[PDB]
Design a protein around this ligand. Structure first.
Ligand SMILES: CCCCCCCCCCCCCCCCCC(=O)OC[C@H](CO[C@@H]1O[C@H](CO[C@H]2O[C@H](CO)[C@H](O)[C@H](O)[C@H]2O)[C@H](O)[C@H](O)[C@H]1O)OC(=O)CCCCCCCCCCCCCCCCC
Ligand code: CLA
Ligand code: CLA
Ligand code: CLA
Ligand code: CLA
Ligand code: CLA
Ligand SMILES: CCCCCCCCCCCCCCCCCC(=O)OC[C@H](CO[C@@H]1O[C@H](CO)[C@H](O)[C@H](O)[C@H]1O)OC(=O)CCCCCCCCCCCCCCCCC
Ligand SMILES: CCCCCCCCCCCCCCCCCC(=O)OC[C@H](CO[C@@H]1O[C@H](CO)[C@H](O)[C@H](O)[C@H]1O)OC(=O)CCCCCCCCCCCCCCCCC
Ligand SMILES: CCCCCCCCCCCCCCCCCC(=O)OC[C@H](CO)OC(=O)CCCCCCCCCCCCCCCCC
Ligand SMILES: CC1=C(/C=C/C(C)=C/C=C/C(C)=C/C=C/C=C(C)/C=C/C=C(C)/C=C/C2=C(C)CCCC2(C)C)C(C)(C)CCC1
Ligand SMILES: CC1=C(/C=C/C(C)=C/C=C/C(C)=C/C=C/C=C(C)/C=C/C=C(C)/C=C/C2=C(C)CCCC2(C)C)C(C)(C)CCC1
Ligand code: OEX
Ligand SMILES: [Cl-]
Ligand SMILES: [Cl-]
Ligand code: NA
Lengths: 238, 187, 449, 31, 48, 44, 35, 30, 145, 48, 99, 37
């Protein structure tokens, strides 16, 4: 499915079909990659689509490996309409700047064992420095919940009681990380991108990516887990 | 117990929804519906009036002593409102957050001004009137409106602030708040 | 009339006394028809008496003027009122026709012939006469088809009907080329009633409206001719109960479903019930809130694709469970809404980001603001807003009034269908009075139940 | 209260059940 | 369609609003309002 | 895409049939019940 | 899921067909009275 | 440990319901 | 632990509003002598000017486990205000009985509950027994004639 | 290894495990690995 | 017997049950109100409250009810109890996001 | 509002909706007249 006929369908022809979560796939073009015209480019309408979510799971026998997970949420995870700019140099050195757009999606997956793992699938503020074949970098990851969120017993960072008030004797005890302090400090995620199926006629590219980011920390609580995400990405130039 | 007849077939006493009130050298049209309150939100409040259900809709004056001749001597309205940011209320968390959005880095509370006004009196005194949209991170009832009016008498900075809610702004209290604001007379 | 000793039915069931009295039955029916036409005329004239030119028709508690205006009388581009003389003429014609029908009803109720069988065999009927029952059904089916074709004629050559989906805020447009495709017509019928499909309430264009009316008019005329020229088959005879109270029970179940459907039409549909005349729907007011809070915060220099809520989901924009972009907040539950003020901003991916940022229109922005300020939220005092709000605005939506009243009427008419289905079955069986006390069926059955 | 509640619930089942089952078996034994 | 709305029903000759038992119901109603779905709301008026 | 779905919501899908075998088995089962009902006639 | 959908669909249309043809199978003749 | 108790009490009430429906004293016409 | 006296930045003394009996949770506020609310532990903390970190409340102790000590850290000020909400501040050894944290009733309270419930049950018993005495002859039924 | 099931007083799990039931619906296998797809014949499945 | 599974067969016991049900219900409500006269509430479940304090991820309808009750108390105390002179500022009242 | 010729007839139009409620109450008055016969 290309970007040409995606715009050719109305709302009601994709309504409920699931097409609206799919990145365009460049059917035409070549795979030689090097024929991209270098220059000062301002990419517009960046598109991102996962195809697998895996979570690092700790096992009693010491094997540390990424497990297959069940997507609890429905098709609310892809990212569209991202903007930015990137440069292409003579040898192939490319840096990637991502600034505005819908670059985040709250996602929840099930570890085998029935444990809900909420993670903000994000790519915001990405600096991808590398070559045309592969370019990696860091991106900002917000926590999940904002500070104005409050847990089932009030509390929370901006708005709440700051204390478990449902029991008037447990005001100061070992539940320090649960009521005394609430931490929403934004973390950093690691992603790797690759370019394939370029089109210099209409200035559009494709490729696969590889992201690794932590999950929600439950606002300074039980440890986060690293989320390895694989999928396809799509973009256009200037 | 005094023997007097009741009110029937003789027209209503008051219908305009406003009442005058006279205090320390200032006269304005208070909301006839609003209840007075005894909580001195600032250490220099002469009169405070607030709406019956919510204390979001509150009107009060301040009587700060002055060392200046006139508010024109303060300069621009922007420089003037730059001096009185504590009227909004300082942010009471040092916790760092940028995972809210709509605000700045480790900031979750903002104030956007929709304009400034200068109302000259009979001979030479101006009235600085503003309108601050003070919004919040949770969007608490859409933020709040701050309608601030300032004028100086012989000392005793008489500044009027009419706080009102955003949902209260459009559901039918805008004209009441504006009638209270534009009637703030200091003679 | 009669007393209880000659009928066995008390005064609180006195109409039952005229089950077998065909002339008085006909008079009661046409007197009732006079009442319906009288209320239509009286309320219509009352509404045009209480009409203010400035305020739209949903702010003033109007429920008949929006119907006439939907037909395309006295309204133009955008929904402003050009004249109320069509409404006045409708009300007056209804009042005078009600006078005529009431004269007829009073006549057959007081001095009309007792039964129409011995002298006017065309009109007199017995309830077990399946041929003449289908004959009367065919006459009324021909009348219904003629009414549906009158609406089709009004939409095609008599000024057109009001379209809210036409550009520029909508206007009265002449329907050209209605959708006569049988698949499009009956896919609504076969459709599920649930979210995303809405059964027939999700008809969203006047071409589908008038095509469905062409189909219903032609099928109704065909069924009328079929019923006049046939007699019910033996399988239908075995399947049914053939008393007058049974026919009443069937009618009650049918109009109960019709009342529930009208409840859902008033609450959800915005093309047959244009939002300019009837006010915003619930989904419309929620999407309007999110929309205008998007544009206000855009004009206050903020980003909309970013700024997730307290839950990490997106305050202004999120993705629906199928993928396309929808408005953030609890209004996500109303993501199924489709209105004329969102479609110019809505593309293949749901809400287009660049179109939503740049291609705002002033009339759309005002319409969103008003559909916030006049949401279908109110009390029985006609106090607008949620139940915690002030007593300052006098507004309850006509959609709210219509949906509530017609759900109540649909529910009681389903219960009346139960009452009449049971009593008609028991009367055909011989049980309407009680158990016989010497031929009790349970005494002829084995014990242990 | 996690073991004391358990024994209280077990007592409140068994004791009235025992009483009523005394009375029922007595009653049914008389045909 | 909701229940009856009797808030600020009685006012005095000078327009002040007298609290009423319906207004105590309104106060409890506000407490029941704001706390319910505490995180689900993003906008002031709860039309959804 | 990460997982396979029908995505049958909306679309005005008649009787909720996304594949023709659904309509065929609905018609066929109603037909079998009609067949037993029809052949078991001229009774009672 | 499609197999489950076909199974529930055939179960529902089977039971609903039973209901339809059971009430077509001369139901006002099941009374224990005269009439 | 508590879900065990709650599940046992619920199925006990359902068992007494079943026994009361299908194992009642048969009423006699006389 | 000692009487905690709370004081403002400028010189006024702040008193903790003591907990009324009806409330299971009560907000923490500090008010002056004259009856004006001066500080609180705010729930919102947003666009606010009564919070402890900007009012500047310091807590001192007199005559208990802590004598003469003054605390100005807002966290310990808030915990001592929340304890002073419940009246005089105490240390409780919570590990001895594995205490859950929620309040109990007195022997007086349980006595009143048991005797009032038993008292209403005995009111019904009195009514039923007086009924049986006055209506002894009609206990098996009425006289048919 | 250092807290095996026979140390936990477990009685019937050795009789499930000896004949083949090793994975559970809790995502773990008692041999020490993770049950990504335990199926219906796990410990809890055989119990139910 | 054929609809519900069990049915009455004694008129006297039927009418005694019709007498017995509302009397026992109202007496139990009376006993509970007598308990509430001394503030002997069934307000809390200690196990679920301590679990919800030691886990943000634990959310139930009972905990939602507890939060709603805090909202009721704090938003009704000032106007319902004038004797306490409770001038709670708008600052400290419990409040969710938006609304 | 109503057309100018029908402005003096607006008060008589303002009562007209209540006639059906008067009709059902009139049915009850008639039954009281025939003494619930
Ligand atoms: C099978 C029968 C099941 C009936 C109940 C199932 C639920 C029906 C329902 O989802 O109800 C709602 C549906 C309409 O569904 C709505 O349909 C809407 C269609 O609107 C769309 O299309 C419209 C086109 O104008 C507009 O454009 C609108 O803005 C746009 O969003 C939306 O899609 C909504 O999401 C969708 O929920 O009504 C209808 O189908 C009308 C059909 C009757 C429903 C009656 C409900 C009450 C039923 C029984 C009560 C009886 C009790 C007696 C015993 C006791
Ligand atoms: C839609 C309402 C309606 C209608 C159309 C009817 C109609 C009828 N009912 Mg009836 N009824 C109703 C409601 C209604 N009822 C209700 C609510 C009750 C419960 C109280 C009853 C209880 C009842 C009983 C017990 C009986 C009837 C009977 C009758 C029939 C003859 C009545 C008669 O001639 O006696 C004479 C009546 C009068 C002399 C008074 C009527 C005077 C006029 C018509 C009143 C209206 C005036 C009108 C404004 C004038 C318009 C003129 C025009 C030019 C504009 C008749 C067809 C009788 C029957 O079944 O026939 C055997 C019978 O005995 N009804
Ligand atoms: C207290 C009794 C009462 C009252 C006051 C009302 C009042 C109303 N009902 Mg109603 N209804 C009631 C009882 C009542 N109902 C009961 C008991 C039921 C069964 C449960 C229903 C079921 C029902 C349904 C199904 C519907 C209404 C609807 C309506 C509204 C419009 C009526 C209408 O136009 O219908 C139509 C009038 C006719 C069919 C008569 C024929 C009129 C002809 C065909 C129209 C000709 C127009 C033509 C195009 C003009 C062009 C002329 C030429 C150039 C061609 C109205 C406010 C409608 C609505 O708005 O939904 C909310 C609607 O669809 N009701
Ligand atoms: C167009 C529909 C229709 C028709 C033609 C009939 C016709 C008939 N019904 Mg009937 N019924 C209906 C609908 C209908 N019913 C509905 C919807 C219900 C509700 C479940 C009932 C319940 C009912 C009962 C219980 C009985 C009948 C009976 C009868 C027979 C005698 C009626 C009579 O004179 O009573 C006299 C009329 C009155 C005494 C006036 C009633 C006054 C009501 C209570 C006031 C309601 C007005 C109020 C504004 C409603 C608001 C509710 C809602 C809109 C918010 C008669 C043949 C009787 C029968 O079985 O005879 C064979 C009988 O026992 N009906
Ligand atoms: C006037 C009667 C009376 C009163 C006022 C008290 C009061 C008190 N007793 Mg006591 N007790 C009593 C009679 C009484 N008792 C009798 C007759 C016995 C012998 C059985 C005991 C044996 C006893 C022991 C062993 C202990 C106490 C203790 C206590 C103290 C702790 C509070 C409490 O009881 O827990 C709370 C009370 C309740 C939760 C009662 C529930 C309220 C009603 C009755 C509900 C039950 C009805 C329902 C049908 C039960 C079904 C439940 C089932 C599913 C399990 C308290 C001051 C404890 C203590 O402090 O040690 C010193 C203690 O350990 N009592
Ligand atoms: C098709 C039904 C079925 C299936 C698939 C299972 C499966 C299982 N059961 Mg089980 N069980 C069943 C029915 C079933 N059961 C029934 C109906 C009962 C009630 C009586 C039980 C009661 C039961 C208990 C109490 C236990 C199990 C246990 C088990 C598990 C391990 C089996 C085991 O311990 O190996 C060993 C099985 C045996 C050693 C049986 C040996 C048979 C003897 C040697 C036969 C000797 C006499 C023979 C007639 C002579 C042979 C003559 C020769 C010449 C042919 C296993 C998952 C165990 C468990 O793991 O706990 C959950 C366990 O404790 N089951
Ligand atoms: C009380 C009175 C009655 C109350 C309300 C009645 C209101 C309206 C009645 C008409 C509603 C629409 C009818 C068609 C519904 C339909 O086809 O559903 C079809 C729907 C569609 O099902 C779903 O459709 C979706 C897209 O449309 C997706 O494709 C899903 O995959 C699919 O499962 O399935 C059902 O709703 C189940 C119907 C089962 C009916 C069982 C009861 C029948 C009993 C007796 C029948 C007697 C005759
Ligand atoms: C009493 C009645 C008893 C029995 C019913 C008897 C006869 C029924 C006649 C029609 C039977 C065939 C319908 C099934 C069918 O054609 O599937 C075809 C479609 C199923 O839906 C279509 O299926 C296509 C493949 O055949 C595609 O895959 C698409 O999903 C869709 O276009 O049925 C319908 O959509 C309409 C059926 C109802 C009108
Ligand atoms: C997605 C598709 C499902 C949509 C469902 C609707 C499909 C269209 C059916 C509409 C027919 C209208 C029935 C009205 C008469 C029924 C009363 C009756 O029964 O009256 C009964 C009467 C008694 O003599 O007989 C008769 O009048 C003859 C009965 C006429 C009915 C014709 C049935 C069509 C073919 C039936 C199934 C094809 C059978 C194949 C399966 C068999 C095994 C493989
Ligand atoms: C029988 C009977 C009955 C009754 C029934 C009915 C239902 C009747 C009716 C009737 C009717 C249904 C009537 C109606 C009518 C109408 C009329 C009588 C009219 C008219 C007209 C006019 C005169 C008008 C005028 C005007 C105009 C034109 C417009 C403007 C204004 C005005 C208003 C001026 C009853 C129940 C009691 C009882 C039983 C028996
Ligand atoms: C206008 C229009 C349209 C069209 C429509 C149409 C076309 C309709 C129709 C329709 C139809 C065509 C319908 C049908 C129907 C029917 C029904 C609904 C029925 C029934 C019945 C029953 C339920 C039965 C029962 C039974 C059985 C089951 C067996 C035995 C016997 C008995 C009777 C019991 C549209 C929507 C497009 C659009 C809008 C407008
Ligand atoms: O869910 Mn329970 O509360 Ca009936 O409003 Mn909308 O939704 Mn939700 O918010 Mn408000
Ligand atoms: Cl809640
Ligand atoms: Cl909201
Ligand atoms: Na909220």
């Amino acid at each position: 499915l290309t970007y040409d006929e995606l715009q050719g369908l109305t709302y009601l022809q994709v309504k409920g079909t699931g097409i609206a979560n799919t990145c365009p796939v460049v059917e035409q073009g070549t795979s030689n990659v090097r024929e991209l015209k270098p220059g000062d480019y301002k990419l517009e309408k960046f598109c991102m689509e996962p195809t697998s979510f895996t979570v690092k799971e700790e096992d009693a026998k010491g094997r540390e490996e990424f497990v297959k997970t069940k997507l609890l949420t429905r098709l609310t995870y892809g990212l569209d309409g991202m903007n930015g700019s990137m440069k292409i140099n003579n040898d192939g050195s490319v840096e990637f700047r991502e600034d505005e757009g819908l670059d985040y999606a709250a996602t929840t997956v099930k570890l085998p064992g029935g444990e809900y793992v909420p993670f903000l699938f994000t790519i915001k503020e990405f600096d991808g420095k590398g070559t045309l074949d592969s370019f990696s970098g860091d991106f900002l990851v917000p926590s999940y919940r904002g500070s104005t969120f409050l847990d089932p017993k009030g509390r929370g960072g901006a708005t709440g009681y700051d204390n478990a008030i449902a029991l008037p004797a447990k005001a100061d005890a070992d539940e320090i990380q649960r009521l005394n302090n609430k931490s929403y400090t934004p973390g950093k995620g690691s992603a790797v991108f690759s370019v394939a199926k370029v089109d210099t006629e209409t200035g559009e590219i494709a490729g696969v990516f590889e992201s690794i980011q932590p999950s929600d920390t439950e606002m300074g609580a039980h440890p986060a887990k690293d989320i390895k995400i694989t999928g396809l990405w799509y973009g256009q130039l200037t | 117990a005094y023997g007097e007849g009741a009110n029937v077939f003789g027209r209503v006493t008051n219908k305009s929804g406003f009442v005058p009130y006279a205090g320390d050298s200032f006269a304005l049209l208070l909301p006839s519906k609003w209840n007075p309150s005894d909580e001195k939100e600032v250490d220099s409040i002469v009169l405070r009036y607030a709406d019956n259900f919510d204390a979001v809709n509150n009107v009060y004056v301040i009587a700060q002593d002055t060392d200046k001749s006139s508010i024109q001597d303060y300069g621009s309205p922007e420089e003037f409102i730059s001096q009185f940011g504590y009227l909004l209320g300082r942010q009471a968390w040092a916790g760092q957050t940028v995972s809210e959005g709509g605000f700045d880095a480790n900031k979750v509370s903002s104030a956007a001004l929709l304009g400034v006004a200068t109302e000259k009196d009979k001979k030479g005194k101006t009235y600085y009137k503003f309108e601050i949209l003070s919004r919040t991170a949770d969007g608490n009832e859409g933020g709040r409106h701050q309608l601030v009016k300032a004028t100086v008498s012989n000392g005793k900075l008489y500044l009027l602030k009419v706080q009102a809610g955003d949902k209260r702004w459009f559901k039918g209290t805008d004209k009441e708040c504006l009638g209270v604001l534009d009637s703030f007379t200091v003679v | 009339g009669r007393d209880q000793e000659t009928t066995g039915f008390a005064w609180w069931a006195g109409n039952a006394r005229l089950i077998n009295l065909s002339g008085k039955l006909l008079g009661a029916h046409v007197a009732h028809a006079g009442l319906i036409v009288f209320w239509a005329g009286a309320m219509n004239l009352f509404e045009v008496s209480h009409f203010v030119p400035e305020k739209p028709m949903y702010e003033q508690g109007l429920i008949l003027l929006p119907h006439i205006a939907t037909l395309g009388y006295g309204v133009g581009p955008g929904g402003e009122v050009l004249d109320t003389f069509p409404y006045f003429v409708s009300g007056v014609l209804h009042l005078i026709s009600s006078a005529v029908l009431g004269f007829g009803g009073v006549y057959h109720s007081l001095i009309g012939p007792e039964t129409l069988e011995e002298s006017y065999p065309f009109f007199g009927y017995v309830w077990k006469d399946k041929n003449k029952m289908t004959n009367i059904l065919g006459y009324h089916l021909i009348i219904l088809g003629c009414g549906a074709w009158l609406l089709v004629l009004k939409a095609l050559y008599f000024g057109g009907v009001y379209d809210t989906w036409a550009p520029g805020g909508g206007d009265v447009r002449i329907i050209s080329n209605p959708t006569t495709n049988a698949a499009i017509i009956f896919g609504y019928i076969v459709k599920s009633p649930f979210g995303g499909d809405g059964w027939i309430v999700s008809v969203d264009n006047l071409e589908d409206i008038i095509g469905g009316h062409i189909w219903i008019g032609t099928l109704c005329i065909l069924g009328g001719i079929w019923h006049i020229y046939t007699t019910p088959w033996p399988w239908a005879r075995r399947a049914f109960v053939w008393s007058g109270e049974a026919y009443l029970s069937y009618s009650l179940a049918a109009v109960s479903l019709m009342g529930f459907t009208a409840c859902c039409f008033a609450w959800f549909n915005n093309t047959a019930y244009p939002s300019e005349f009837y006010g915003p729907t619930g989904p419309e007011a929620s999407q309007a809130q999110a929309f205008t809070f998007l544009v206000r915060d855009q004009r206050l220099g903020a980003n909309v694709a970013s700024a997730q809520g307290p839950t990490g989901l997106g305050k202004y924009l999120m993705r629906s469970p199928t993928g396309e972009i929808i408005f953030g907040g609890e209004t996500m539950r109303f993501w199924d809404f489709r209105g004329p003020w969102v479609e110019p901003l809505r593309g293949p991916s749901g809400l287009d980001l660049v179109k939503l940022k740049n291609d705002i229109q002033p009339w759309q922005e005002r319409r969103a603001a008003e559909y916030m300020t006049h949401a279908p939220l109110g009390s029985l005092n006609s106090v607008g807003g949620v139940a915690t709000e002030i007593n300052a605005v006098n507004f309850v939506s006509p959609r709210s009034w219509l949906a509530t009243s017609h759900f109540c009427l649909g529910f009681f008419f389903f219960v009346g269908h139960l009452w009449h289905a049971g009593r008609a079955r028991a009367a055909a069986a011989g049980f309407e009075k009680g158990i016989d006390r010497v031929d009790e069926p349970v005494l002829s059955m084995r014990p242990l139940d | 209260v996690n073991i004391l509640g358990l024994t209280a619930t077990a007592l409140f089942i068994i004791i009235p059940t025992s009483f009523l089952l005394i009375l029922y078996v007595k009653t049914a034994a008389s045909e | 369609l909701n229940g009856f709305n009797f808030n600020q029903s009685v006012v005095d000759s000078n327009g002040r609003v007298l609290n009423t038992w319906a207004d105590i119901i309104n106060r409890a109603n506000l407490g029941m309002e704001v706390m319910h779905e505490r995180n689900a709301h993003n906008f002031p008026l709860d039309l959804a | 895409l990460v997982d396979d779905r029908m995505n049958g919501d909306g679309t005005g899908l008649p009787f909720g049939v996304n594949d023709g075998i659904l309509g065929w088995v609905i018609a066929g089962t109603l037909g079998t019940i009609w067949a037993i009902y029809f052949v078991s006639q001229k009774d009672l | 899921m499609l197999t489950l959908k076909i199974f529930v669909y055939t179960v529902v249309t089977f039971f609903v067909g039973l209901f339809i043809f059971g009430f077509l199978s001369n139901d006002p003749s099941r009374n224990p009275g005269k009439g | 440990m508590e879900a065990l108790v709650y599940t046992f009490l619920l199925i006990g009430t359902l068992g007494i319901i079943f026994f009361s429906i299908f194992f009642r004293e048969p009423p006699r016409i006389a | 632990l000692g009487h905690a006296s709370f004081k403002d930045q400028e010189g006024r003394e702040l008193f903790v509003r003591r907990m009324p009996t009806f409330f299971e949770t009560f907000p923490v506020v500090l008010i002056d002598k004259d009856g004006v609310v001066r500080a609180d532990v705010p729930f919102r903390k947003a666009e606010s000017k009564y919070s402890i970190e900007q009012v500047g409340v310091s807590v001192t102790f007199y005559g208990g486990e802590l004598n003469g000590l003054t605390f100005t850290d807002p966290s310990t000020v808030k915990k001592y205000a929340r304890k002073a909400q419940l009246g005089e501040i105490f240390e409780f050894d919570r590990s001895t009985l594995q205490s859950d944290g929620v309040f109990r009733s007195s022997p007086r309270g349980w006595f009143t509950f048991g005797h009032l419930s038993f008292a209403l049950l005995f009111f019904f018993g009195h009514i039923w027994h007086g009924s049986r005495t006055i209506f002894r002859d009609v206990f098996a039924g009425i006289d048919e004639d | 290894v250092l807290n095996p099931m026979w140390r936990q007083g477990m009685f019937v799990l050795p009789f499930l495990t000896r004949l083949g039931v090793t994975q559970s619906w809790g995502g773990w296998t008692i041999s020490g690995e993770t049950s990504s797809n335990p199926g219906i014949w796990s410990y809890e499945g055989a119990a139910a | 017997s054929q609809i519900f599974g069990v049915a009455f067969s004694n008129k006297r016991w039927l009418h005694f049950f019709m007498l017995f049900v509302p009397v026992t219900g109202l007496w139990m409500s009376a006993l509970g109100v007598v308990g509430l006269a001394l503030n002997l509430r069934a307000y809390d479940f200690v196990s679920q409250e301590i679990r919800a304090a030691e886990d943000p991820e634990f959310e139930t309808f009972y905990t939602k009810n507890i939060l709603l009750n805090e909202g009721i108390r704090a938003w009704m105390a000032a106007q319902d109890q004038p004797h306490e002179k409770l001038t709670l500022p708008e600052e400290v009242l419990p409040r969710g996001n938006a609304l | 509002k109503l057309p100018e010729a029908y402005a003096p007839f607006s008060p008589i139009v303002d009562v007209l909706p209540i006639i059906p409620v008067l009709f059902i109450l009139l049915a009850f008055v008639w039954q009281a007249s025939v003494s619930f016969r």
